[PDB]
Symmetry: C5
Subunit: 265 residues, 5 copies
Amino acid sequence: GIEVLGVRTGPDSTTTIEAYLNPRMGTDNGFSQAVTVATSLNPDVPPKAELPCYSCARIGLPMLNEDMTTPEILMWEAVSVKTEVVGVTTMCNVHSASIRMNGGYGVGRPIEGLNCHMFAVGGEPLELQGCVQNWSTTYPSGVVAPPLKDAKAQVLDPGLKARLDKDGAYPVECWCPDPSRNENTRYFGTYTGGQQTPPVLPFTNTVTTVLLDENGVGPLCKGDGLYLSCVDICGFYSEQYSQKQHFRGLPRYFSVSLRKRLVRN
Amino acid sequence: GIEVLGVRTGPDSTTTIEAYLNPRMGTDNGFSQAVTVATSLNPDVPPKAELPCYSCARIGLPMLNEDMTTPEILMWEAVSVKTEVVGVTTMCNVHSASIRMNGGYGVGRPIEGLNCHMFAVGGEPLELQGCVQNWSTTYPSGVVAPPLKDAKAQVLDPGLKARLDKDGAYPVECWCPDPSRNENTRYFGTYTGGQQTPPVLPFTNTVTTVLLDENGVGPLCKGDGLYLSCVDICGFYSEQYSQKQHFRGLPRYFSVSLRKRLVRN
Amino acid sequence: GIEVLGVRTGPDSTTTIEAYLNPRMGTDNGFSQAVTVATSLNPDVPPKAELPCYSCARIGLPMLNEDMTTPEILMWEAVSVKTEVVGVTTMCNVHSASIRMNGGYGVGRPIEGLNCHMFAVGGEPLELQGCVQNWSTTYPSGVVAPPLKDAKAQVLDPGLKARLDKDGAYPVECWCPDPSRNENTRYFGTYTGGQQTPPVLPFTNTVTTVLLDENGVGPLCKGDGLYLSCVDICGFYSEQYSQKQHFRGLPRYFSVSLRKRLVRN
Amino acid sequence: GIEVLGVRTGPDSTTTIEAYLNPRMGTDNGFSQAVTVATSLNPDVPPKAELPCYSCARIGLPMLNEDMTTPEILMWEAVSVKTEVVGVTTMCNVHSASIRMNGGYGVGRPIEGLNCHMFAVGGEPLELQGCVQNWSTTYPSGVVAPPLKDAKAQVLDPGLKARLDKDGAYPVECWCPDPSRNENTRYFGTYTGGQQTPPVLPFTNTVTTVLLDENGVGPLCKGDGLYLSCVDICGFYSEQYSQKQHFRGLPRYFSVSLRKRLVRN
Amino acid sequence: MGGIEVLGVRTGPDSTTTIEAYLNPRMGTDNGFSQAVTVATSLNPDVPPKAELPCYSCARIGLPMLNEDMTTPEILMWEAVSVKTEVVGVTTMCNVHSASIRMNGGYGVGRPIEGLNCHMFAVGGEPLELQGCVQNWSTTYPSGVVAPPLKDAKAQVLDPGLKARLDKDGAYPVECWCPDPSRNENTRYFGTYTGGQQTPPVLPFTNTVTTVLLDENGVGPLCKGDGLYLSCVDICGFYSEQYSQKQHFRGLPRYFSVSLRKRLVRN
Ligand SMILES: CO[C@]1(C(=O)O)C[C@H](O)[C@@H](NC(C)=O)[C@H]([C@H](O)[C@H](O)CO)O1
Ligand SMILES: CO[C@]1(C(=O)O)C[C@H](O)[C@@H](NC(C)=O)[C@H]([C@H](O)[C@H](O)CO)O1
Ligand SMILES: CO[C@]1(C(=O)O)C[C@H](O)[C@@H](NC(C)=O)[C@H]([C@H](O)[C@H](O)CO)O1
Ligand SMILES: CO[C@]1(C(=O)O)C[C@H](O)[C@@H](NC(C)=O)[C@H]([C@H](O)[C@H](O)CO)O1
Ligand SMILES: CO[C@]1(C(=O)O)C[C@H](O)[C@@H](NC(C)=O)[C@H]([C@H](O)[C@H](O)CO)O1
């Protein structure tokens, strides 16, 4: 929809935005509540404190357009991002009361099992497609879940759409980034499943992701807002005694480089 | 057989087609019926509801040639595709009545085990080669299976050919893309086997596959039809109580970029 | 010692050869006989029907030379190959009488365990080096095995050489491609071992292997013969009842692009 | 803060610094003390001898500026590094009193399990962010640990910062490289978790890491000091009898190439 | 290179040569396998027999003599430009019939060779330089191998006093020596370790892959005294005996094809 013109250069034509997003694993400090499992598909009633959710934030950018009626206006364009999962080294902890290896004689199992890592940078909220494993699930009060009127919600029902517009409220397991939308967002996601799978987590300050599309255009920040989204499920913590499991998530740092872009109003 | 001439440029000379294909795991909503296993190679009678099939669709394109008598005509040429498995994040669900880890105390096993992912874009139906694990298998009414007259069907019998011309009817286990044909289709497949293997599933809107061949020519859409095919087996769901297993499949999104191509009539 | 001159261009100066090789796992239709294991290194008597062998074929090429006595002649030069393992999707079969997962309640184990994949394209037979795990093995009548006079056959004995000159007769376990020869053949092999290892098998029609050497020269077809070789061990099938194991192999398709090359006679 | 001008070339304008850092696994000679595991999150009292720490060193460089009053001065600029984990081949040891495979009949388990590898090269101390798995942990006397006033220390609390300014004193599990700082340091880290995970360790003298940023500027050595940091946890040693586990770390070699850089004083 | 002033490449007829060689593995006995490996019950005494210790393979290949007169202000050296190297006998590990521990509770085939893998090759103009490092400083290394002195526990990490040259085939145990990254200016070495208990070996075999040996300045190893030095180890995992369940290291031979050219240097 937007006719993109030339990059605007000169003093104060570029800025770097730094932010971090703390994980929303179901409680505030990096872990879900002990996860409970239904004995059948119905009733299946996951409590809110047991459901990892997407993290998201809108960063206000410097105001560009005193007059919004001119035939051309300026927009902040996200050119590149350096992003880092913070606290990776915490998973070298094998002393804090996990299930012990070597039949109880060795160290605690580290955080391990399914991993799901996603970050997104856009000029508007991340657009979501609803999809669930079990259409009979009762999602709790306090989360935004797709309506579940029939089993088509287990595959692609094009009626089930949302915008990631609240931090710690959209459960990861019932929403994915919508590939049919997000023209103005770049999202990067990986899932590695299995039971006791080793997490593989890099940490470096040397890797830049370019956000420019095929035509050399980055996300354009509507209303001078930059939208950051992520989830970083790093696996499960097993309690030594109960052997109950908790989702473990880690915070994510973002450094986004932006430039002014002229567009046709 | 088609003499390919120059690309036709100018207004309305390009179009993007967006489509999704819901998985055909043997029932309509992402899962096979509980899979049964023969005690011997004969009789071996897999029910239709237990056999994953290829997904396919023909998308009608804008009509190009009201007059088909000219010495040159136009065909839509598929240049590139962005494709995404939708609902990957549903496999972060460990509460919906799966077999529990840590001897029954931990979370449910996630969907895991053998993965088979394929997508194809072509200007005609995907061409298939018949090949089976067990030539004594009785395939059910309601699926298209190769004739099984002898054990050569377990390897390459060049008599066993078909076109993927019906959605949810050609079982994955008795047909593969025919590498000896498919001049006018690009197909991309991976199988990762094993028992409890971690699924590894990316989800991003930043990856484009170019469909042009060695000569810079993409699939040419015969009769103004674009043909999309896929399968996305993501592993097995284990029922907590029975411990019976179901194939789990996920829907696939396609965005195909096309341009008009002049050809000799 | 062939002096290679210019490529011959013009009408009929290029051709594509298409062929498939059915696997030789010890019986004709993709599986070994149930594999037996010696209780000691001597006697160790593997039956022929239990020993996977290399597949190979010589393709006769079109007549190139109206005269063989001229100071220059033409040879077919193999420039590139597209090759595909056929029937990969058969390994989505979990119903055909394999050992059942989840303590007998789940699906059959898929084909899994050690994988060995090799293809070769040359202008003469693949040259082999003899090497065995157990020099005391008695190889059966009907296979070509290296002489085993001492334990040096377990490492590199340069006296143990052969040419791959018969389909389904040279066991994989006692011959490998000779890196000290094969000047006029390109071979590409991978072994992935272990007990229950997931097979990882791509299937696409989009990947070309270039056969040109450092000097831009492909294999030159001596006697107008193109030589194709492969093995594709995809793992073991376990019988549900006996729990005996069979090698499973899959057929391989080749499409080789050739051009006429002038050489000094 | 530093205005960077041209590279200074000519005789003695470049130097190579070679150094090694011995690992700090909790005792001096490559192993932690046998690791103990709390039965609950509180009390959780890891002894110092059981906590791997970062290695670090400041290397004095040739003094550049006898006169520090000129409008321009020289700084050593770190351009590239070759770095190697030393003693990788020690992990071919299966005789030194580890838990024996094949039910006690086979060789000892090699060093295996979680791996955490990081190296950093900078012109000042590595900047650290505090983050822990368990905010209730009591860190011992003799290590530098972040204050733990609340559970925010399990995620990102921006109040928890430090500089890596003492060798063998900053525990890996409560500090990570701060991605919001370290403008004048390059750090490269990988974590591979799990219980018995195979360590994958290259050793070659052929691989160079370039330390130049986006603008062609390497770390600038403040006070003519080069700062090297690392950790190389290679997994756990299991005692044959007790089955107690010890962290195993290996030393790291650095070769850093530097050049003189003019900067505005 | 080191103290050598390197001048131009010498071209023309006979200015290049290819050296082909193979090195048979030294797993502790001569024919690809260690003796059944024994394990100490404690760190002291820990007495691995020589027949149970994999060692590095190495060879010096004599090259065509270049300088009958060694008094000229410039002389020629053979320069190693590239290598094609292959582990030979990879396909032997498709053997599941030769008396290994049987899978499926005794009903299936024998376990293939599997477990820890350690692969290294080196090409140089002088012997590979080694750094001493051990897992257990209390180990008693046997007569007939060259092991570093073990005076204290620093030998478990980096003790810069513990240095050697790989100057004898089948004598330097892999587990107490690694390539010295602080030396080997005139050698390129390439090593990988993949550990674990029953880990799948992943072994390519192709004749299409060339490793370039030129450094940052376009200079390959220079063959001092017209000698080319080849080193390797290829531990492919363990063989388990069906009855005893004792384990043996399995190693495979390595083939080298090294391309060399004449290089002018200042004498
Ligand atoms: C007793 O109440 C709860 C609980 O444990 O907190 C409530 C919770 O909503 C429910 N969870 C789900 C996913 O349905 C859980 C299971 O039914 C039960 O643990 C199975 O044993 O029961
Ligand atoms: C009871 O009838 C069925 C079933 O359960 O649905 C019919 C089904 O066609 C058949 N499946 C196959 C692949 O042959 C199955 C097995 O023979 C049986 O489960 C083995 O125990 O039996
Ligand atoms: C009964 O005769 C056979 C068999 O089973 O067919 C013959 C076969 O040559 C032999 N296989 C090998 C590799 O030696 C096998 C085993 O010795 C036996 O199964 C051990 O239990 O015995
Ligand atoms: C007996 O004293 C100690 C020990 O073993 O040295 C003290 C040590 O601080 C403590 N470690 C931790 C991480 O808390 C440990 C465990 O509480 C105990 O081993 C559980 O059985 O007990
Ligand atoms: C009987 O003498 C030996 C043996 O078995 O050959 C000598 C050998 O040097 C020694 N190996 C090591 C690594 O120390 C071994 C073990 O001490 C013993 O097997 C423990 O069970 O004992």
